[PDB]
Amino acid sequence: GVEALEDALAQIKSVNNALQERVEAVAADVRTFSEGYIKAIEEHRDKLLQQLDDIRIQRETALQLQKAQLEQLLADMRTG
Amino acid sequence: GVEALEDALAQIKSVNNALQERVEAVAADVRTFSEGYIKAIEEHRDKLLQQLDDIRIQRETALQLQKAQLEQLLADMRTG
Amino acid sequence: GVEALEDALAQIKSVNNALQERVEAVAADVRTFSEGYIKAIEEHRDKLLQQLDDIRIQRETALQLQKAQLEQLLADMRTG
Amino acid sequence: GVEALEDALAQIKSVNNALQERVEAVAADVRTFSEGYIKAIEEHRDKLLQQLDDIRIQRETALQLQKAQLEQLLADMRTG
């Protein structure tokens, strides 16, 4: 009778509860993934930038050891 | 043998400017990707968080409306 | 004299080894990152695609439970 | 009070199509984003992998050219 109305009414309030749970959860995940993602990008971007700078630097150095080892040979000629 | 070496020098010198530029370019793109990428990740996170919101809003309103409806019977059945 | 020419020649031949290793490493990493990413994207795209499917399902069922609970009432009326 | 419940029924029916669509569309986006993300990661890896490669070529050939140049002196000094 009026029994069944108050039931359907309590169910609705709960079957809704559990659906909002599912949505918040999905939203939580989107946030987790999106945060974790951006981070991993920054880290990886940094490493790469780092290694490029080391390439830039280990190169200027090699340049010099040649540039020099060569001006030695020049001298070795112009002299003895 | 002198002029020879004067040359090896000039060669070493200008092979360097070139490889310098290139590395600087890789680094540039390494930058550009990450801002673009992090932009997109953000944009999309938002668009998804938004529709997830709309699902909630839409379902809540239908709850409120439906509750209101069955609340009315609830009174009109308490006597009515 | 000729001593110092084969040194500079073993230098360049070695200093290149080191620069290749460096560039190799970089590209190695670009590889793992992109691979690592694409995985993560697939995994999250899947988990999401999955939770949303659960949301339709868990919704269809809430619907039917309501509909059915309502028709019960509508009948409780038409009869006793 | 039948009509009331005949009404709830119809409301439930119509709320549900709407919430179906919205969840569909959410999922449609989850699909498209991963296609973009994945696609353009891959473009990038390729772009960078290419340039790293060119750094290699540009250096490799400069080495070849320099090697050849100093190989010659080596001969023209191993006699005169």
From Swiss-Prot, chains A, B, C, D:
Protein name as it appears in the record: E3 ubiquitin-protein ligase TRIM45
Gene disruption: observed consequences: Deletion mutant mice show earlier onset of death and exhibit higher mortality in response to lethal challenge with LPS. The production of TNF-alpha, IL-6, and IL-1beta is also significantly up-regulated after TLR challenge.
Whole-protein coverage range: 249 to 327 of 580
Function as written in the Swiss-Prot or TrEMBL entry: E3 ubiquitin-protein ligase that plays a role in the regulation of inflammatory response. Mechanistically, mediates the 'Lys-48'-linked polyubiquitination of TAB2, a regulatory protein of the kinase TAK1, leading to its degradation via the proteasomal pathway and inhibition of the TLR-mediated inflammatory immune response. May act as a transcriptional repressor in mitogen-activated protein kinase signaling pathway.
Ranges in coiled-coil conformation: 2-80
Family assignment from sequence similarity: Belongs to the TRIM/RBCC family.
Record's subcellular location: Cytoplasm; Nucleus
Domain of life: Eukaryota
